[PDB]
């Protein structure tokens, strides 16, 4: 009970529905399911075709260019939970390029654990606005929906009356349904994790989404964490072992799994049947236990791997030594950084080089946690052990307080890094200790960090004069070592009722400094009474090709008028 | 007569007026005159000081930081003509940083032949708007006037009545004078070259500016071209020889000039006493004649010369072989190109490299006329035989129809060349024949030519539909080899009553091309009747790091409405 069917690990079906009868009886498929590329199908090829047995899928689900199909309500009436270990560009549901697919009817779907949903190029699909993803998913901001029949606003995706919850989200009540028949089920604000029953009572604390009886671990529908023999359990009691984050197996099971590659031979650690041990650990001929020892090399294919998503990431989960090179390239739009961090470089070494190209949303590099050493035994072409280009939000590389970096060979290469100011670049040169290598134009001295004044120098206001209609500031006249390079004073002002954060001024005559009576100012007229303003001033100076004198800026301050 | 004084070749006076009595008697100074750096002078040190004898100066005149002096009307009441062979950053008159200098009174100045006038940092000088430079100079657009007492508008620089010509130039009549006494003399519109006399009759056809009697070569004031013994002459009759573009000398003169370096030893060619012979020529022990022979190396100092003006240029006048390297660097603002052309590279070879850095107004390189060969035996650092950077108007390098180029070693290096499209760059690679050398980022593939769509591809309009209020164009759907790279259609339209020369359109669905019914269009509404318009369309596509498919543009066309 709770799963009368079988496992039937994931296999994918092509070109006709003949192999689909291999996947009839099974209750929960381990792995993934893809149905793709069936052109010669008919709508009649699905009315005699249904699978209520399938309830939960571990990893992901994909639909791609199968003709004649218009719905999914018959094929998968009872699919409920997607866990999403192996993802698909941080998705698990791929609804894509499906000609004639006009509805889904996936009402029994309740929770998708990890991943997102991408829907594209499906010019028949409607009923899409009636789908509250936030009930089913957490990060609704990673769901991409375009090129659909809804995108030319035609479909009256309604239900006859009350039933379907009309929930305000953005402007007004959004009726929530799947078909014109099937509503979207809403559990109350207390049965949220484990799900609710029909009348709305909470399920058992080990249920998930649906339960056949309220508060019963023997009468759930889907387990929250783990399954053991009619009871969803919080953990494995001995002598049982966790396997693939959903069940408890005995020693004999995962034991005899090892004996079949004679491919993922398995071992046991931390009461969990696992593929491999991390570093410092050992096999066991007795029981395949990760016993510690003295002294993990994830040797790539061709010493090189493009990394672009979680699907790229989890191949490097738990690695310690990378015998190759890495190309980080996320044409993205969404910060993967936490999920990026959670399966990345608990490492120190890279044998080859490192390359970061054209990635958009990488604001940092701190997800590299333990990284210390770059061997660089195979360089980037042009003799580089490191690279950067076109990183529209990258500001911090690391905090160099505790983070260290050791680089053997190669050079640095920075271009078009518009929020990466040169200060941390020279700091990275310093901590790297390879400052005697970089030639001219290894650093783009015109594009790096050219969207915020950064570096060191600070303006300080000497005198402040206010009125109801007058503002006069006085500040120390800064002069760079070439006093001709000063061009003028960039002043930035606005009002601010919060504190949560344009005129120009010619420089005065330097001429001396025993008594340089040259404290510059600007009179403001555009004042409102009793009104909080926000003003800060920046130094606008001449660019020079050499190590340019960085120029100053002032603090953002706050002034309230009469 | 015409020059009763002497020559007294140019020497410059410093720190007190003691050496000034060396330059009393002389009528026309050959060379240049600089007066500079006399702090401890008084205004009384000039009332007992005058030199009416000086009339014409060959090369240039410079005034720089001498105190106590307020005028020039007594020092040089009769200076009249500046010829300007050796110039000073394309100037011959340097009025600069003169404390207490409040007027000039240079009424007897009539024509400045070659060069310009720069006035700066003279916070006492006025009477400046009353000076028509176009009477005295040709290129008035090369005269830089700033930081003066006129720049804080105070001086009433007037004359009591009529006298001084009140000439409209820009808005109204500009009274023309030097002092409150001395008007600015205007000759009529027929005596313009040689000058006029007091009543306004034309002078002789060999006079210049002033003449003591109307139409008399024996009673001029200053020669137009050449001087010979009371008569300004068009040329030297035999046995006389031209010398420094102003006189005629016998064989004995320039003969005995050679005998004094035992520094510019002289020779004779083309009836002109000259410094040296050009290539293929020979000395003569008999008469120092440039006789032709079989088989000119201007060997630099340190193989290197910054070139920035005509003063830099004329050191390389007439050279044929440059045993060094050249750095072209004109922070400019004015096209020197014709004067640049007229004394430059009648050459073929450069032993070292070539470098062009940060020059502004160099639109071309065609002033390099005969240039063929770059040896490059000493490279630019980073292994380059060539360079470019920051050339805000450089578009054409050459016409490769007849112009050739041979490069031995080194590489090319292009950055920030915003009107230099890559087509001619690859053509220069082709003609150079050194295409198998340039690495990645030897060409900045993001900044070069990024201010005008250039390269090859051309849109063509198929169908045109008009009305009094409707404009519909049809044109051939271009598709780059990646059809996903097409993003949309940039359309540029405006009206044009002359013919002397903004909306966007999504791409349609490609899907095939037996019958690709995808001719794109745009309907216009903003039409005036009977009205000539000007429309052209550009292809807005995706950038790629590789050899990008260049994208197309349309012709500028002309459409008149109903």
């Amino acid at each position: 009970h709770l799963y009368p069917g079988e496992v039937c690990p994931g296999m994918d079906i092509r070109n006709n529905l003949t192999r689909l009868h291999e996947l009839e009886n099974c209750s929960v498929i381990e792995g993934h399911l893809q149905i793709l590329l069936m052109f010669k199908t008919r709508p009649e090829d699905f009315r005699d075709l249904s699978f209520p047995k399938l309830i939960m899928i571990t990893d992901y689900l994909l639909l791609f260019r199968v003709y004649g199909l218009e719905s999914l309500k018959d094929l998968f009436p009872n699919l409920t939970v997607i866990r999403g270990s192996r993802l698909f560009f941080n998705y698990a549901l791929v609804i894509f390029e499906m000609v004639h697919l006009k509805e889904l009817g996936l009402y029994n779907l309740m929770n998708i654990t990890r991943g997102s949903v991408r829907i594209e190029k499906n010019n028949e699909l409607c009923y899409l606005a009636t789908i509250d993803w936030s009930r089913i998913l957490d990060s609704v901001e990673d769901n991409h929906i375009v090129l659909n029949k809804d995108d030319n606003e035609e479909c009256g995706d309604i239900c006859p009356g009350t039933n379907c919850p009309a929930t305000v989200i953005n402007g007004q009540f959004v009726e929530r349904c799947w078909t014109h028949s099937h509503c979207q089920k809403v559990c109350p604000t207390i049965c949220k994790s484990h799900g609710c029953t029909a009348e709305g009572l909470c399920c058992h604390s080990e249920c998930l989404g649906n339960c056949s009886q309220p508060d019963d671990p023997t009468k759930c529908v889907a387990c929250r964490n783990f399954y053991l023999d009619g009871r969803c359990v919080e953990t494995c009691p001995p002598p049982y072992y966790h396997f693939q984050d959903w069940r408890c197996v005995n020693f004999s099971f995962c034991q005899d799994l090892h004996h079949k590659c004679k491919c993922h031979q398995y071992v046991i650690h931390n009461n969990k049947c696992i593929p491999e041990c991390p570093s410092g650990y050992t096999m066991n001929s007795s029981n395949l236990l990760c016993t510690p020892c003295l002294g993990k090399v994830c040797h790539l294919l061709e010493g090189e791997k493009t990394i672009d998503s979680v699907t790229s990431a989890q191949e490097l989960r738990g690695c310690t030594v990378i015998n190759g090179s890495l190309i980080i390239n996320i044409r993205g739009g969404n910060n993967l950084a936490a999920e990026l961090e959670a399966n990345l470089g608990l490492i120190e070494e890279i044998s080859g080089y490192l390359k970061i190209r054209r990635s958009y949303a990488l604001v940092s590099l701190s997800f590299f946690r333990k990284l210390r050493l770059i061997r660089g035994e195979t360089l980037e072409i042009g003799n580089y052990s490191f690279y950067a280009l076109d990183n529209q939000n990258l500001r911090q590389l690391w905090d160099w307080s505790k983070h260290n970096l050791t680089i053997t060979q190669g050079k640095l290469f920075f271009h078009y890094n518009p929020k990466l100011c040169l200060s941390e670049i020279h700091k990275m040169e310093e901590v790297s200790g390879t400052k005697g290598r970089q030639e001219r134009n290894d650093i783009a001295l015109k594009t790096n960090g050219d969207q915020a004044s950064c570096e060191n120098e600070l303006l300080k206001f000497s005198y402040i004069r206010t009125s109801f209609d007058k503002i006069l500031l006085r500040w120390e006249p800064y002069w760079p070592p070439d006093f001709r390079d000063l061009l003028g004073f960039m002043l930035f002002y606005k009002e601010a009722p919060y504190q949560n954060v344009v005129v120009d001024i010619d420089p005065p005559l330097r001429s001396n400094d025993p008594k340089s009576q040259n404290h510059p100012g600007w009179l403001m007229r555009g004042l409102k009474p009793w009104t909080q303003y926000a003003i800060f001033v920046k130094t606008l100076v001449t660019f020079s090709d050499e190590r340019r004198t960085y120029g100053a800026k002032s603090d953002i301050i706050y002034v309230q008028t009469d | 007569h015409l020059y009763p004084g002497e020559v007294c070749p140019g020497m410059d006076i410093r720190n007190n007026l003691t050496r000034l009595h060396e330059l009393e008697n002389c009528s026309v100074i050959e060379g240049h005159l600089q007066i500079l750096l006399m702090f401890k002078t008084r205004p009384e040190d000039f009332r007992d000081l005058s030199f009416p004898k000086l009339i014409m100066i060959t090369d240039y005149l410079l005034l720089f930081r001498v105190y106590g002096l307020e005028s020039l009307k007594d020092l040089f009441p009769n200076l009249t003509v500046i010829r300007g062979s050796r110039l000073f950053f394309n100037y011959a008159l340097v009025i600069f940083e003169m404390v207490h200098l409040k007027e000039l009174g240079l009424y007897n100045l009539m024509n400045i032949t070659r060069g310009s006038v720069r006035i700066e940092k003279n916070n006492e000088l006025c009477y400046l708007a009353t000076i028509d430079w176009s009477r005295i100079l040709d290129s008035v657009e090369d005269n830089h006037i700033v930081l003066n007492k006129d720049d804080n508008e105070e001086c009433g620089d007037i004359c009591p009545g009529t006298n001084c010509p009140a000439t409209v130039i820009n808005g109204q009549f500009v009274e023309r004078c030097w002092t409150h006494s001395h008007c600015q003399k205007v000759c009529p519109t027929i005596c313009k070259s040689h000058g006029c006399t007091a009543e306004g009759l034309c002078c002789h056809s060999e006079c210049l500016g002033n003449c003591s009697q109307p139409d008399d070569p024996t009673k001029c004031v200053a020669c137009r071209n050449f001087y010979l013994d009371g008569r300004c002459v068009e040329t030297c009759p035999p046995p006389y020889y031209h010398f420094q573009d102003w006189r005629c000398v016998n064989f004995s003169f320039c003969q005995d000039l050679h005998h004094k370096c035992k520094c510019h030893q002289y020779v004779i060619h083309n009836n002109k006493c000259i410094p040296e012979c050009p290539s293929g020529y020979t000395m003569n022990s008999s008469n120092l004649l440039c006789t032709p022979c079989l088989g000119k190396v201007c060997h630099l100092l340190e193989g290197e010369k910054t070139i920035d003006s005509v003063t830099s240029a004329q050191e390389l006048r007439g050279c044929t072989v440059i045993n060094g390297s050249l750095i072209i660097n004109i922070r400019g603002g004015n096209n020197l190109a014709a004067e640049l052309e007229a004394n430059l590279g009648l050459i073929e070879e450069i032993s070292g490299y070539l470098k062009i850095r940060r020059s502004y107004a160099l639109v071309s390189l065609s002033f390099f006329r005969k240039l063929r060969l770059i040896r490059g035996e000493t490279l630019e650092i980073g292994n380059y035989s060539f360079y470019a950077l920051d050339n805000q108007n450089l578009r054409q390098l050459w016409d490769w129809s007849k112009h050739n180029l041979t490069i031995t070693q080194g590489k090319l290096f292009f950055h920030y060349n915003p009107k230099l499209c890559l087509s001619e760059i690859h053509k220069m690679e082709e003609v150079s024949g050194t295409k198998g050398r340039q690495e990645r980022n030897d060409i900045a593939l993001k900044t070069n030519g990024d201010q005008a769509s250039c390269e090859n591809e051309l849109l063509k309009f198929s169908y045109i539909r008009t009305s009094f209020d409707k404009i519909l164009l049809r044109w051939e759907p271009y598709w780059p080899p990646d059809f996903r790279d097409l993003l949309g259609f940039m359309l540029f339209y405006k009206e044009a009553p002359y013919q002397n020369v903004v909306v966007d359109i999504d791409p349609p669905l490609r899907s095939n091309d037996p019958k690709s019914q995808n001719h794109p269009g745009w309907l216009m509404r903003g039409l005036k009747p009977w009205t000539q318009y000007a429309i052209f369309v550009k292809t807005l596509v995706t950038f790629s790091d590789e050899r990008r498919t260049y994208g197309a543009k349309s012709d500028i066309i002309y459409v008149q409405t109903d």
Binding site: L36, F96, R118, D308, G333 | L487, T542
Partner: peptide, 30 residues
């Protein structure tokens, strides 16, 4: 300013790439 959409188009292109890259080689094994 609006260049994030200009990269977003390429994001769509990369997504188009990856699925085809899945479809392409399970067949040549010879």
């Amino acid at each position: 300013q609006i260049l994030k959409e200009l990269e977003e188009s390429s994001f769509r292109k990369t997504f188009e790439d990856y699925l085809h890259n899945v479809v392409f080689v399970p067949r040549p094994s010879r």
